Every structure is written in C-alpha cells, then in structure tokens.
Amino acid sequence: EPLKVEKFATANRGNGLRAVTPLRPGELLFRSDPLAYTVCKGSRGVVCDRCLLGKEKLMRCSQCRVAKYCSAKCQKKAWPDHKRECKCLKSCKPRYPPDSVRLLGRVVFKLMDGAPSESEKLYSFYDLESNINKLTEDRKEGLRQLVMTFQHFMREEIQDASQLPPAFDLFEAFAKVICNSFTICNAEMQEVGVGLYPSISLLNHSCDPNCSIVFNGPHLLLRAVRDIEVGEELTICYLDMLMTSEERRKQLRDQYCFECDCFRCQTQDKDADMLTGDEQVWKEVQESLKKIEELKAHWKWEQVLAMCQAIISSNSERLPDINIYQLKVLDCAMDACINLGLLEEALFYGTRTMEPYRIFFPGSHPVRGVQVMKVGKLQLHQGMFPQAMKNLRLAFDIMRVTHGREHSLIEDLILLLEECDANIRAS
C-alpha cells in the first residue's frame, strides 16, 4: 500500500508529517505497534503486561513476580521482550523503577537484540527530538537522576557501552523519552501503559488538530479527523482537551519545550467557560482531583466514587458541570460506577457530561465518541431504546472517524446498535 503521509522539514517546528494525497475524515493514515512499551505504574498487576487488558485474575512471571499476564499465550509471547528485564526486575526487588526507566530498558533490548522495527519506518529512536538545548538546569538534574536510576536497575544486563547501541547516550535517550512518550489508553480510555512509536512521533501538536490517534491494546491507529489537502501538515493534540490555555502553556513548556501561538492560545479560547463557578470551590476541587486521579490510576473505584460523591452531592457550594474540574469529577464518578456495577448512578453522571463534552471535544474526538457510547450502552440496558439509539448513532458518527473498522471497539458498537434496533423494531 502506498503511504498517504511523508516526513518533511517544517519551517519552525523541526520535522513533521504532511499529506501526500487529499485526506478525508476517518481515513486510516498509519498504524503501528510500539518500538517498546510497558504497563503503567497504576495498572501494573491490574492489566496484562502484553495485551493491556484487565482480568479478574492475572498470572505472574515466576522468576521476577512483577510481570503479570492474562493467559499462558500472553506470558509466552511476551517472553522474548521480557527475558532481559526479568533478571533486572528480580535483582532490584522490592524497588520498582519509574515507568520511563522500564520503558528505556525495553528500547535498549529491542535495539540490541531485535530485528529493525516497523515502528521506525518513517523515523527512528535515533532521529527523535531531544530538545537538549532548551532543557532548564532543573530538567537536566532530573534527567541525570533518571540516567543513574537506569544504570542501577539495568546492572545485571547492561554493564558498559558495549551492551548499548553504538554511541548511545543515556542522557539524550531520556531527553527523547520525555517529549516522545505516548500514553497508551485502553478501550474505555483508562491510561494503562506508556510506549514509543517513533514514526508517529513525527506528528507535531495542535490545540485544534486535523488527526487523532487511538489505541487498540498496544496497537496505534492514526486517522484524519478533518479534510486535509496535499502538502498540509498533519497534527495531533498532545494534551487532554479539558485544560485551560495556561495549563496547556505549562505542560507544552515543561514536557515539550515549546510555546504555542495558535488561535486558541492567543484568544484563551474556552478558558472562561471552563472556569465558571466560584474560584474557591473549583480550586478545592482541582486540589482534590490530584488524589481522585491517583486513585483512578490504581483502579481503586470505591475510593474514587466516595471522593467524587463528596463533591457532586456536597452539602457545601457546588460548581456548574461545564467547569472542567467539576466535569473531571463527574467523569471519574461515571467510570467508578460503571466498574462497580452502579449503572443507574453511572447514567446520571454520564448524562450530565454530555453537553459539556459536546462543547469541549469539537468535531470528531475519540474521548467524546467513547463517552457517548458508554451513555448509550447504559441507556440501552435500562430499556431507554429511542434515547440509547440516538446516543449509539452519535457515538458511531464520531467513532467511524476516530476508531474506524480496524478498531475492535467499532465491532462492539455495531453489536449495541443492532441490539437497540431489534428492540425498537419489536416495540
């Protein structure tokens, strides 16, 4: 198949990707497995190390007892890419390395022992942007500590430069990991892993992008979400949509070393609506969200729900649902109720997010597609067939663009649409 995309040198944002042919919304542009990936801090022992799917019971690697798998197939298939880190994870017990260190170990083993990776077809780990001449002294100190952490963790497998690729610099390698890591999300949009996809790392950022990525386990799909002309730069949004221009400025500086002067950032687009309600209340909710999100990252649903209900149904002052901190609380509560089987209560929170999600996820965004699908599924199983169908159709209109036929969630959605249709036909 001929490529619809190509690497090019941009005028002021380094290398990028641009369209070779005219592109339409939903068009599949690229697909990739990671060069290297690992389970996240919070999802370790909750999801399979290999397929990143959750299971009631996981089977642990007998040698390290750190890697956990859904099946014998996943444990065995993961063995070649786990063999060398196994000895390191076992040796350094009970200490567990930062996710970036575990990830870089897997990069090194892949580059040393594995065949050239399809993930590096357009751009390789060697080519990745490091932004070393923009790093602050504070960041360089942090990277030096990551380098020493890697040297300690990898002691059993990597003793010197002979066991690293030629002229491989660990400080530069961690600088590349900081601004090129992908957060892997499961079908429900829960963060479950971190990975490197060097060809996909050619995509520059936009606060209003024309492309979008989706994960199907560790597999990444890149799709157009707007019409794109020949030669037009392809962009993705690196950030959560529920962020003010000040919050985007801080992350883009701290993690990616750049300043954005796009229309949204120049006009603080949507900031005022995102921060409606009383500042003392949303500052408290924003602070509480640090704990709620940490609990959610560790799949502690009962504790997530308890903290969220204390806000949503507070005896004290409340926020509008369009306030992004209130909205994040509603979304955490919805996901906690779904995972706990409190479907009536999940629908209540989920329905409240629908109008704010319409506003903050314009066009076709996979996060809104999945949220609308969750609400439609909740309504379907409660027998609200005309309402469920409207939402399942809306979810399909978004997800046919953001997920496409190559994503297994689209098959799950088609089954809900057919189920809902049969129910309306028998009514």
Residues binding ligand SFG (CB under 6 A): 13-16, 128-129, 131, 179-180, 201-202, 204-205, 256-258, 260
Q: Residue 67: name its binding partner from Zn ion, ligand SFG, none (Cβ under 5 to 8 Å by kind).
A: Zn ion
Using the minimum distance from each CB to ligand SFG, give the nearer residue, 117 or 131.
131
| Distance from C-alpha of 255 to C-alpha of 263, rounded to nearest angstrom | 21
Q: DSSP characters for 311-361? A: HHT-SS----TTSHHHHHHHHHHHHHHHHHT-HHHHHHHHHHHHHHHHHHS
Using the minimum distance from each CB to ligand SFG, give the nearer residue, 135 or 401.
135
Using the minimum distance from each CB to ligand SFG, give the nearer residue, 186 or 204.
204
| Distance from C-alpha of 305 to C-alpha of 334, rounded to nearest angstrom | 8
Q: Do 243 and 324 meet the contact criterion of CB atoms below 8 Å apart?
A: yes
Using the minimum distance from each CB to ligand SFG, give the nearer residue, 203 or 346.
203
63 is a contact residue toward Zn ion (CB under 5 A): yes
Smallest distance from the beta carbon of 106 to ligand SFG, in angstroms? 19
Smallest distance from the beta carbon of 264 to ligand SFG, in angstroms? 11
Which H/E stretch holds residue 59? strand 59-60
Using the minimum distance from each CB to ligand SFG, give the nearer residue, 107 or 257.
257
Using the minimum distance from each CB to ligand SFG, give the nearer residue, 252 or 319.
252
Q: Which two tokens stand for residue 20?
A: 């070779």
Smallest distance from the beta carbon of 217 to ligand SFG, in angstroms? 22
Q: Which of 39, 74, 108, 329 binds Zn ion (CB under 5 A)?
A: 74
Instruction: Tell whether 258 is in a known binding site.
Output: yes
Instruction: Tell whether 265 is in a known binding site.
Output: no
Q: Residue 39: name its binding partner from Zn ion, ligand SFG, none (Cβ under 5 to 8 Å by kind).
A: none
64 is a contact residue toward Zn ion (CB under 5 A): yes
Nearest residue to ligand SFG by CB is: 14
The vertex-86 CA angle with 85 and 91, nearest 5°, equals 95
In the numeric block, the tokens 């995509």 are attached to 203
Please tell me whether residue 233 adopts helix, strand or coil conformation.
strand
| Distance from C-alpha of 88 to C-alpha of 158, rounded to nearest angstrom | 10
Q: Residue 70: name its binding partner from ligand SFG, Zn ion, none (Cβ under 5 to 8 Å by kind).
A: Zn ion
Q: Residue 132: name its binding partner from ligand SFG, Zn ion, none (Cβ under 5 to 8 Å by kind).
A: none
- Give the torsion sign (CA, 300, 305, 311, 312): positive
Q: Which residues contact 57 (CB under 8 A, 6 or more apart)?
A: none
Instruction: Tell whether 131 is in a known binding site.
Output: yes
Q: Do 297 and 303 meet the contact criterion of CB atoms below 8 Å apart?
A: no
Residue 294 amino acid letter: E
Smallest distance from the beta carbon of 207 to ligand SFG, in angstroms? 8
Instruction: Tell whether 204 is in a known binding site.
Output: yes
Which H/E stretch holds residue 37? strand 36-39
Using the minimum distance from each CB to Zn ion, give the nearer residue, 125 or 256.
256
51 is a contact residue toward Zn ion (CB under 5 A): yes
Q: DSSP characters for 157-224? A: T--SGGGS-TT--HHHHHHHHHHH-EEEE-TT--EEEEEE-TTGGGPEE-SS-SEEEEEETTEEEEEE
Instruction: Tell whether 48 is in a known binding site.
Output: yes
Smallest distance from the beta carbon of 293 to ligand SFG, in angstroms? 24
Q: Which two tokens stand for residue 257?
A: 């070393």
Backbone angles phi, psi at 20, to 5 degrees: -90, -35
268 is a contact residue toward Zn ion (CB under 5 A): no
| Distance from C-alpha of 100 to C-alpha of 91, rounded to nearest angstrom | 18
Using the minimum distance from each CB to ligand SFG, give the nearer residue, 179 or 307.
179
Smallest distance from the beta carbon of 14 to ligand SFG, in angstroms? 3
Q: Residue 15: name its binding partner from Zn ion, ligand SFG, none (Cβ under 5 to 8 Å by kind).
A: ligand SFG
Question: Annotated binding site for S-adenosyl-L-methionine, which residues?
Answer: 13-15, 123, 131, 180, 204-205, 238, 258
Binding stretches for Zn ion (CB under 5 A): 48, 50-51, 61, 63-64, 67, 70, 74, 86, 207, 260, 262, 264-265
Question: Annotated binding site for Zn(2+), which residues?
Answer: 48, 51, 61, 64, 70, 74, 82, 86
